[PDB]
Symmetry: D2
Subunit: 266 residues, 4 copies
């Protein structure tokens, strides 16, 4: 006779968990996550901002890289998120406990974060992580300012209801660089049509392709670097092959249309 | 070079996950969990109560056994807990979504439940589960009444700060049976002395031994049946060898004293 | 010298607090709130649903009217909300404590409900109420079924980010009646243009006028009955003068356009 | 015919709302609240701590006094609480939004804080305030360290289940000063005996008198200064008549015994 199955851990490709030293993107913006998971540190004269943290076990590595950059735990002021899945919001609860950081997120991301990713619209309880509370709720197009760097929220619902693109302007060589950190536009194993948990899913993805296409976007970054053709291990040429926001959105829409056709067939 | 380790799932002995048919304890009280995890159903003319649910993957099995007993999802009114660890409160969030059930717990258990067992005083984030909210907060000695069965809370802090014994009076052969569902009194791998996260840990365990010793207790049940010498697979003799509350408390205190001595040596 | 001002209570017109006996709308749908605040009871063979509860002090009155209708506290299964302001969600926390009811709401309404209406985008902390937790989060167009009555959520953001219309089909004289419970479309004292807390406010109101115009709508009801020209004190002619959803939306848009023009001038 | 009563605001004596300039207690410790509500600022080389905030409308005044002391919003690191009633935790939610501050509290205080003081064991929904979340849960006897000042929690349940005394050592004239910020020991209008919401109320108060009597206590402060015979308007003699912790506890117990006798008679 047969016992219920053991709980299964959320396991990922090794490269997603491979630590890297900080990689500079612009004068105040650094990649400090792993080879294949983005975690952006933005350093200001008035404290630091983190956009995404990657997987739950990455907290101490993030703190090490912040230290290397001159950011102590007390200096971390704000955490922002692309979306509240385990491989991007994983270490947020632990980072809040170990630093001065407060979380800003939209309502959808906040409720998923507070559930630790449980009762996911598509994954159920298969991919969970330590829950955390949001300190500030943001609305579409709202700005947050830290040390004079202005971050704007652009909602792009689909991958999760709370999926967000974050944009800000940094500098490089004395010239402004408009950075767009755009969320995933994938739908991995999702039921797209007639989904009772997400009835307007397709309409939301279509709007989000348009949103991403139109972002202020000298440089595009994504939570998985491969999605925007970044190679974090490629040093001085890490961002050389990066997609524009237009090309990223077009690729995502073409992929999405193909998935829809397959779902209709399958 | 070396990636961060993969997340590790909370895995348990097979017998902890082995489904069993309902085993009657008294006229209205049934064991409906697994061979080695207690989940008690108390059926009243005015709805049902569940005390503990076991592991997260046990939700559907619990619902099956309730159905077998004549309890539909709408009939489940109340969930009570021994303590909010993954192997006793595991399926609570899912049960709340799939039934009419509301959760009553003390403040300590409620905050741990809402974190999904994360940031545990002793386990860190090693043993987590889907978070759930409590609908009612109870105080020490408070009663809750369902269909005329009266449940009394007896706080017994130690194993967790929110550890609770639940007592009620059922019947068997026309005579009252005072049932005591006493929580774990173990301290598995805990730092007992000078623990910065739990400075009065030893004082709390000592008080809890006294509390358990004095419970109204014709029949003792525990979240792990082995702790009270129950054998759920032994049919008509399942409870024959069960400890008294006095003997359970004495055994736990002797074990605890030995662990203290070993900690001092080790 | 001068002390800080005393806290000021949220006071309302007397008619908003004037109890009324249940007024039947269709075969299973009743108005059970006050003369000028809507609270709809929908009775099914499988339990009851409440849509809105009015002000915080209305809980006991609601329970009295439910009792008069044959609905005991245990029979109330579900609370739905138009929006989470004090004069519609006021008694929700108390109703959850005193009944079997669980709350279903969208993410925006859930986070405002959990704050008890504090940190409102427009009112600050001026209009607060006892906080409550949502048991189920719903997405736009999602359905909830109770005793065979099907409720559909239609998001209509503006008055609050989480403003929702609820629609369902009841019967009257053997014929179907498509009921639309549409939220407020007012913006009382709001900064409409360039609002940093709600940057897309005007775009959201415009979309919501279109949403309301298109609802399945044999009979329109609104949280303030006057907004849809209901007169709950008018007995057999209570709903005689009621607006269509089209006329309600058109009136709201004309009002809104006038407010925009005044804001530009003022 | 008669409408339901209007909501009634929580109004207090004018002196409770009378702003005062900062009054120094020891080298790093200041009273910065009102004439009759304590709010203690402790300034360290590594950020500031606030113990209590008074009433909800005191947030801006607190921020003004912090500014006068050289503490900017970003410098406020930690809020601690005596108990989570409206006249001590009132402005906590707003302070968290406007500063860098995180809240540390025990489980009981955290759950009451998250409800905004609603569903109080004794007051019901009569005295509510904006809800806030705790960032850190503390256990009895646990320490928190900021800039080298060590704060110790001493639970003293009774006035609320989560009532806490906070102790720390400051300096004055080159000598250590052991400061005890002891919570209220009052029971205003409480049912003491046989209270179904608080069955061990009397036992908890008795233990708390003993706890307070034994605190390290060169200087006693209380949330209402009058309770410890402080006069914040008396300048250089503000603390001259202050009670010892022993005398404060003895007075509270004598008062409590009298209230018990009256309850038995009345
Ligand atoms: O290309 C992307 O956007 C992408 C790539 C891989 C995986 C995913 C999502 O499943 P995650 O972001 O939740 O991991 N998204
Ligand atoms: O004897 C007991 O009380 C016992 C036995 C085994 C394991 C444990 C605790 O680790 P759990 O209750 O969290 O599983 N406790
Ligand atoms: O016509 C309406 O929709 C209306 C009427 C009066 C007041 C209001 C809003 O302020 P409330 O719904 O928050 O009370 N709205
Ligand atoms: O002496 C005291 O401790 C005292 C004095 C006045 C009022 C109270 C309590 O009601 P509060 O602390 O909730 O205001 N307590
Ligand atoms: Zn994802
Ligand atoms: Zn345990
Ligand atoms: Zn409103
Ligand atoms: Zn108080």
């Amino acid at each position: 006779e047969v016992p219920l199955p053991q709980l299964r851990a959320y396991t990922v490709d090794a490269s997603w968990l491979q630590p890297m030293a900080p990689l500079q993107i612009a004068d105040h913006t650094w990649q400090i996550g792993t080879e294949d998971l983005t975690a952006l540190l933005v350093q200001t004269p008035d404290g630091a901002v983190l956009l995404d943290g990657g997987m739950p076990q990455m907290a101490s590595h993030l703190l090490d890289n912040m230290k290397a950059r001159g950011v102590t735990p007390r200096d971390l002021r704000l955490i922002l998120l692309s979306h509240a899945h385990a491989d991007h919001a994983g270490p947020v609860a632990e980072l809040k406990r170990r630093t001065g950081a407060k979380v800003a997120a939209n309502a959808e991301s906040a409720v998923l974060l507070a559930r630790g990713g449980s009762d996911d619209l598509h994954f159920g309880d298969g991919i969970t992580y330590p829950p955390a509370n949001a300190d500030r709720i943001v609305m579409d197009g709202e700005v947050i300012t830290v040390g004079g760097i202005v971050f704007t929220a652009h909602f792009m619902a689909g991958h999760t209801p709370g999926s967000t693109a974050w944009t800000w302007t940094d500098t490089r060589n004395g010239k402004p660089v408009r950075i767009a950190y755009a969320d995933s536009l994938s739908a991995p194993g999702y039921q797209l049509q007639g989904n009772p948990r997400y009835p307007h899913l397709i309409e939301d993805y279509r709007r989000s392709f348009a949103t991403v296409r139109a972002l202020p976007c000298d440089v595009l970054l994504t939570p998985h670097p491969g999605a925007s053709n970044w190679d974090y291990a490629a040093g001085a040429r890490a961002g050389a092959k990066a997609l524009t926001c237009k090309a990223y959105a077009d690729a995502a829409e073409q992929k999405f249309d193909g998935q829809l056709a397959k779902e209709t067939a399958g």
